[PDB]
Symmetry: C3
Subunit: 274 residues, 3 copies
């Protein structure tokens, strides 16, 4: 079934850019690639090129120009396409709100947990039968990659919070005050966004080593002015150079393979399929 | 694209009637209007007429005869149609359950917050791309209208609770005891219903001044007999005259425009669109 | 509309088998039956036969061979088909995780409450209009049947926990640690599974006496190794003989009708329809 145009393209690391991150810059020797999927179009062309001898595939989850809101993303096509290229590692870069004073706008967070409060994403899996698949996601992120992101941040002198629970909401509207109080005071979540689920579910089912590098862009409803879309975008674009510096530091060190014992999803299917 | 039959019809105030409220009574000079929408049919004909020189559009959200349950309402068509008529203010009248002893059957509530626990409403926005829109809904109701409803209630001698958090559930079944304990004791919500979301989301995106006048019809699972549909309908029909008296008091005072500084959604799109 | 092949088949008790329970064994005089529904195919053929003079209909909710995951089950077709055969009682057998130390793998639980945390089941009711139906589900299980299951377990010498709140999650992935902490410590649920909703909703709307016999197969994320699909299936298959012994004990005593005063859904429609 699988066809790419141009043919024969492969990559080792995938980067899924979120808010503010619509192009890479600069993969060398870039090529725009069309990757067939059983689910139709990924968000945009995938750009494949080289970073210090490592082949990287970049996909803007919202499309170039931020054309696709969180609820309308073809998550299945995006992850299928990256898997079809041969990627082993996936770095997601995302904008998040903070539910705690000490996670400040401009700080990075490398989450370790999530809570799914989405509702309208239509498909939360690749496996609709006849092989029933129930992956374990107790520890949903790839720890090998998490630790490499934290190390890079520290080496560059950036603040990187080493843990966090991400509450994923449906959107596109932001939370009410009453909702935000539930997330913060009842669920004791740390950060909030709209795009993690079902991206992470699908990455795990695909046996990828996936981790999120989140940038705090706002304090949700808790600052004297509530979050707006314009604020999020401005803070992300202001800080995108720091995100790029982290990526160009991390990627050369991903030439090898994830360590199985620090990659919860890397053999996910072995015990998950009935 | 926009066509009405008859042509040329406009209105200033919209009223969305809930349980028990299927006709107005009596807009003068009433006309039934068909309003084209990109989403198909609204719940029913919209009835447009005059109340003390203010043009009012009435829409029964469940259709005449209560034909459309909460999960099957074409929320996008309903709000598009009201916007297309030129309305600035939208009064929703709704039946709710109470999660607290002091919010008693027969009392009105003018909520200020909500928590969305729906799942199956299919579209929670008008904006699916390519313009991505994330409206702020920290304070989701229009405060100008809330205060006018409270003032009218007080002037008429009715009990009107001046705040409340509405938990919106999916339905159509009512809550289990275990669910109701979560709403009451964990989320600390005050009232419960099925129709607020995504109606309110869409109204905000449409830059309307929307507020809910809720009538408590029951105590959910917490009275010696649990809520039934027959009970809700009976209590609403018993009290509909009081709701009508409030409307005929409020509407003449809506001849002007919402105050921007007391209308959180009136310029929602200015900072929400990417 | 209603056609069966072969024609004329009727049954009194339905059994909906979950994980590990794909065939009965041994209804005498078994026949595989096709039952037309307005919703298309049930999960598999329904097998009808006799158990000590009581006519029983068995339906594997996942299909033979566990071909259909929880989110892909045609719940409406399954319950319509059982109702069309004339069943009055429905015993569901299900695998669940435990959120409490004392509900141990191998123990049975007869839940009394549930919390619905699903999102993607598409239809949560039979009633989409023009008759609006809102069933009361404060006490969602049929108490007559619950008590008969508990009595059978005790008579056979098995551990059967006499109450429990079932949290139904969407899946197919298992919960994260952060999610499981919400279920356990915030919602104070006892057991967790994926298939109860909307099966139970539909059974109640169909005026069936429905109860769940759950078998604890795992402790979710809380044991030194998190739950896997292979573990659940193995524990269920190891214990399926005990589930069969309970069924063959209970079924002969269901020759009569549910007691109305101990069957919350048996006249559900009387007060639910508008
Ligand atoms: C560009 S504005 C929209 C983006 O903001 C992200 N995000 C940032 N702050 C928040 C917040 N407070 N709540 C929800 N999502 C947020 C979401 O993942 C979404 O794609
Ligand atoms: C006419 S019965 C159905 C209506 O009852 C309203 N409602 C009243 N009481 C409750 C309650 N306790 N829980 C949920 N919705 C309720 C819902 O919004 C729905 O449209
Ligand atoms: C055969 S593995 C999948 C089945 O496990 C059941 N189940 C058992 N343990 C759990 C658990 N911890 N969480 C969710 N569902 C579970 C679900 O209802 C599902 O159909």
């Amino acid at each position: 079934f699988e066809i790419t145009r141009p043919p024969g393209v492969r990559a080792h690391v995938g980067v899924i850019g979120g808010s503010g991150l619509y192009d890479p810059g600069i993969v060398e020797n870039p090529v725009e690639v069309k990757v067939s999927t059983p689910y139709g179009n990924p968000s945009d062309f995938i750009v494949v090129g080289d970073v210090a001898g490592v082949k990287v595939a970049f996909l803007p989850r919202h499309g170039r120009g931020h054309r696709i809101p969180p609820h309308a993303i073809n998550y299945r096509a995006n992850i299928w396409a990256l898997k079809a290229l041969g990627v082993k590692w996936v770095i997601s870069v995302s904008a998040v709100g903070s539910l705690r004073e000490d996670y400040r706008p401009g700080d990075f967070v490398v989450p370790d947990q999530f809570i799914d409060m989405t509702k309208n994403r239509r498909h939360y899996t690749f496996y609709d039968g006849p092989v029933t698949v129930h992956v374990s996601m107790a520890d949903p992120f790839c720890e090998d990659l998490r630790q490499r992101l934290i190390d890079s941040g520290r080496r560059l002198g950036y603040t990187v919070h080493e843990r966090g629970t991400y509450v994923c909401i449906e959107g596109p509207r932001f939370s009410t005050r009453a909702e935000s109080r539930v997330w913060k005071d009842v669920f004791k979540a740390d950060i909030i966004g709209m795009t993690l689920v079902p991206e992470i579910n699908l990455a795990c089912e695909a046996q990828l080593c996936y981790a999120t590098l989140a940038m705090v862009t706002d304090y949700d409803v808790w600052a004297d002015r509530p979050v707006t879309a314009e604020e999020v975008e401005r803070v992300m674009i202001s800080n995108v150079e720091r995100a790029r510096r982290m990526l160009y530091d991390v990627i050369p060190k991903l030439a090898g393979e994830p360590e199985l014992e620090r990659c919860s999803c890397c053999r996910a299917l072995d015990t998950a399929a009935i």
